[PDB]
Design a protein around this ligand. Structure first.
Ligand SMILES: O=C1C(=O)N(Cc2ccc3c(c2C(=O)O)OCCO3)c2ccc(Br)cc21
Ligand SMILES: O=C1C(=O)N(Cc2ccc3c(c2C(=O)O)OCCO3)c2ccc(Br)cc21
Ligand SMILES: O=C1C(=O)N(Cc2ccc3c(c2C(=O)O)OCCO3)c2ccc(Br)cc21
Ligand SMILES: O=C1C(=O)N(Cc2ccc3c(c2C(=O)O)OCCO3)c2ccc(Br)cc21
Lengths: 149, 149
């Protein structure tokens, strides 16, 4: 569980926000892309796995699960690519709720920046620092550190 | 010192590689940009501070130290902006040594990817996972987790 992440793709302002969620902590990383392609997904996963110990990725849809570039990047980075099928049905809803919450945050900061990509990174910042009392950033670090010991 | 980072800018293939090093661990994040402007630097710092608890950054030169956009981002993200003058002279050399090693890694993977930005991210991955036996990615997580408790 410390190495498990879920991909999520959501849409805003005619663009795509790609999100990776660290399932046990709720910590996220995100980027704005013009469209979700295998190549963009593969590059996002290489960035993520260079930053955190990514063991398994639950992919967000079958096109990315199938994509040969995604599979090349998972092989390169040592990642086990799995489906993201919500076998525990509370999954569809957790992700939907996360997308809702992110977009709400983006709307709270949207006026402070011109580019959507800046507002998305502000929202990443606010989500990961929010006290829930630990934050997601604190949880992911404690989870992986406990794992290291 | 768990919250201290150093920015570093280096050049390759007529492009700029912007690097943030977590001083205590050697862990890095990096990006390729066409040129090192305040706006790119500010955006890079926002991304970094949304992913790790960045308390202080030693900026890589006086133009970023001065940049009003950089200072706006440091204010937004709660980051103390400092100079990066090597008062400990071994700093000039440690950074030079890092740039040399990164470029070496890049040259080792350069042929596996078409875009420079992909090879840079492969090199981030190899650097942060290399055991020297803890890796930089392991050190940074242990350092911050110790700090959390
Ligand atoms: O509200 C949520 C949520 O459900 N999460 C996902 C999530 C998944 C698993 C978890 C989570 C979260 C989370 O609440 O962030 O928290 C405790 C650990 O288990 C979010 C992630 C980003 C953003 Br913006 C909002 C949210
Ligand atoms: O709000 C902004 C912002 O406007 N940018 C920088 C910026 C400066 C000038 C611009 C910008 C942006 C931007 O939104 O990226 O959009 C193009 C027009 O001119 C930020 C970078 C980091 C952080 Br925190 C906040 C911001
Ligand atoms: O060779 C180095 C180095 O000196 N570091 C920077 C650094 C700074 C401070 C440290 C470092 C390192 C490090 O070796 O990464 O190691 C232990 C903690 O103290 C590098 C970072 C990335 C890459 Br690619 C190469 C290197
Ligand atoms: O080696 C590549 C690669 O070529 N890319 C993907 C890629 C696919 C097709 C392309 C690419 C790239 C790329 O280098 O980004 O360049 C444009 C030409 O067509 C990678 C993404 C993640 C990871 Br790991 C490795 C790679």
């Amino acid at each position: 569980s410390p190495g498990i992440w879920q991909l999520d793709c959501t849409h805003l302002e005619g663009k795509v926000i790609l999100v990776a969620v660290h399932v046990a902590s709720g910590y996220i990383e995100a980027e704005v892309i013009p469209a979700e392609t295998g190549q963009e997904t593969a590059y996002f996963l290489l960035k993520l796995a260079g930053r955190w110990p990514v063991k398994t990725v639950h992919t967000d849809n079958g096109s990315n699960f199938t994509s040969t570039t995604v599979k090349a990047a998972c092989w390169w980075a040592g990642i086990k690519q799995e489906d993201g099928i919500p076998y525990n049905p509370q999954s569809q809803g957790v992700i939907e709720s996360m997308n809702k919450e992110l977009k709400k945050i983006i709307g709270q900061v949207r006026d402070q920046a011109e580019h959507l990509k800046t507002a998305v990174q502000m929202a990443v910042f606010i989500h990961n620092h929010k006290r829930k009392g630990y934050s997601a950033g604190e949880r992911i670090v404690d989870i992986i550190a406990t794992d290291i010991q």
